[PDB]
């Protein structure tokens, strides 16, 4: 069925599963035409397909050529997403195929179910969590590979870098969702927090900076503060009056 707060731990069990987010598949800029009308220009997008236990990210780059000459692009994008996730599953050895695919948006359910009819034993599920995977395009190295692509392309990343050598996947997913939520709420400030310190760098084969455990605790704190700060700026709330119980709920409530 649906995935929510009652079954958080199921994401980090040994049943292979993937999250599929389609929010960056069909991307456009809206602009005025010479005649004063409005038109869209597509730009490259990506499917965000993630194993939350391992960090493996199957990033299918959606080149703008896939939209050429097509109608009803927002509808097509859901089916294109489903087609590509299906092709990925079929490309994987049987013992690597997922037992469950969790879609972040319920509009993906029927497209993916239909494309996966050949896999009756793979469960297609929605989720009540509001996961911030849209902010993936705020990770500089992901945004770069998407915008530079001149053709359809699949790129593989581990979105946890080497974190799993030191922390569990429940903690790694918590860190990733906190980072993505912050980048989604205030991207400039989140990148400022992450990159303000020259002495901490991003390894060539990593997405995030090489923080020590203690620095990650500092970074995570600065991200919660950013989420709380924006929360107050948004609703005109004096954050100083807020209690720790109120804060957990505000930050936890965002996802």
């Amino acid at each position: 069925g649906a995935m929510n707060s009652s079954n958080y731990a199921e994401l980090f069990n040994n049943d292979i599963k993937l999250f599929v987010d389609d929010t960056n598949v069909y991307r456009v800029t809206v602009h005025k035409t010479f005649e004063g009308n409005v038109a869209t220009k597509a730009i490259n997008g990506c499917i965000f397909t993630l194993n939350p236990k391992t960090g493996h990210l199957f990033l299918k780059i959606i080149h703008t050529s896939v939209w050429a000459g097509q109608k009803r692009l927002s509808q097509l994008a859901k089916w294109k997403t489903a087609e590509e996730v299906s092709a990925l599953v079929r490309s994987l050895p049987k013992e690597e195929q997922p037992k469950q695919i969790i879609v972040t948006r319920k509009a993906m359910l029927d497209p993916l179910e239909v494309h996966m009819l050949d896999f009756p034993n793979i469960a297609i599920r929605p989720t009540e969590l509001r996961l911030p995977f849209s902010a993936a395009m705020s990770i500089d190295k992901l945004s770069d590979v998407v915008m530079k692509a001149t053709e359809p392309q699949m790129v593989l990343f581990n979105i946890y870098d080497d974190w799993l050598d030191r922390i569990s996947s429940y903690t790694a997913f918590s860190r990733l969702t906190l980072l993505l939520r912050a980048l989604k709420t205030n991207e400039e400030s989140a990148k400022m927090i992450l990159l303000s310190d020259p002495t901490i760098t991003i390894k060539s084969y990593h997405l995030w900076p090489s923080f020590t455990d203690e620095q990650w605790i500092t970074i995570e704190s600065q991200m919660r503060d950013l989420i709380l700060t924006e929360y107050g700026r948004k609703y005109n709330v004096n954050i100083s009056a807020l209690t720790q119980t109120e804060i957990k709920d505000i930050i936890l409530g965002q996802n």
Partner: protein, 300 residues
């Protein structure tokens, strides 16, 4: 005009004959139904006065034999039977008409309702849906499940309607997933019509039989089947013009005949709003849309 003789009516019962109904009291001098129009299938149905549970009944065609009803006190129901002895049959039949112990099938001459509800319903096709080959008539009741219901339990006592499932490999061509799901023309025209039903007449007969079993017995699986067969057509962009026009007529008479007080349970709000206002055929069902909007505007 043909006759269905009742040995007797030992228990108080509401008797249906097609779209008509009448009450018979416990041990009342009732010996059956006369003047039944030759040329149509018919349904004789029952609801016991002391236990409205289990409506049940028999589809039959008087051209296929001489049929009568006799109560079975062991199984507790009015059973249809066939009388092979033609002269015994005509003889008993004549005795009860001479005594006026029968109700007359009450067909008004202006009225084409029954024809318009059963135009495409054939006894031979009923007997493939309701499997009991030793009898020429077919028993249906309120609780019988459909083959699809059993997939989602006794197989001998099931309604073997044609399985329709929009998220099935039969409905969806590999490589045409979005096309086939958003426009069901392939599934309707190639899989169902050409492949399974062979022609639209057989498709409509199943649709009409499913409607009648939903209406007369409150058979839920039949109601599901009737709505699936409507939705399949309405969700196809390419339907022969003659099928659309016939479907409009078929549905018009069905909505016209439905008891107003059963509309909340026999009409699926989602399916009808989709079909009438969002589907490819939203503008092709003029008569059905007009009667629906004037008779059941709440549902929409």
């Amino acid at each position: 005009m043909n006759t269905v003789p009742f040995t007797s009516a030992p228990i108080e019962v509401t008797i249906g004959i097609d779209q008509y109904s009448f009450n018979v009291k416990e041990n009342q001098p009732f010996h059956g139904i006369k003047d039944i129009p030759i040329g149509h299938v018919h349904v004789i149905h029952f609801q016991h006065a002391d236990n409205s549970s289990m409506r049940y009944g028999y589809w039959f065609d008087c051209r296929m034999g001489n049929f009568y009803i006799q109560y079975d006190p062991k199984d507790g129901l009015y059973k249809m039977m066939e009388e092979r002895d033609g002269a015994k049959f005509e003889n008993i039949v004549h005795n009860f008409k001479e005594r006026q112990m029968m109700v007359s099938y009450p067909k008004i001459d202006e009225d084409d309702t029954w024809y318009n509800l059963t135009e495409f319903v054939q006894m031979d096709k009923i007997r493939k849906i309701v499997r009991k080959d030793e009898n020429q008539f077919s028993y249906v009741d309120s609780s019988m499940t459909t083959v699809q219901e059993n997939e989602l339990s006794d197989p001998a006592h099931s309604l073997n309607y044609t399985v329709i499932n929009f998220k099935s490999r039969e409905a969806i061509r590999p490589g045409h997933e979005m096309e086939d799901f958003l426009d069901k023309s392939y599934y309707l025209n190639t899989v169902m019509l050409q492949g399974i039903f062979k022609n639209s007449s057989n498709y409509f007969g199943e649709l009409q039989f499913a409607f009648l079993n939903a209406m007369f017995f409150g058979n839920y699986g039949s109601s599901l089947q009737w709505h699936a067969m409507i939705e399949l057509i309405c969700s196809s962009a390419t339907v022969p013009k003659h099928m659309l026009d016939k479907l409009d007529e078929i549905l018009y008479y069905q909505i016209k005949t439905l008891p107003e007080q059963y509309s909340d349970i026999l009409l699926n709000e989602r399916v009808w709003n989709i079909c009438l206002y969002s589907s490819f055929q939203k503008n092709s069902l003029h008569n059905t849309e007009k009667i629906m909007e004037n008779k059941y505007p709440e549902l929409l």
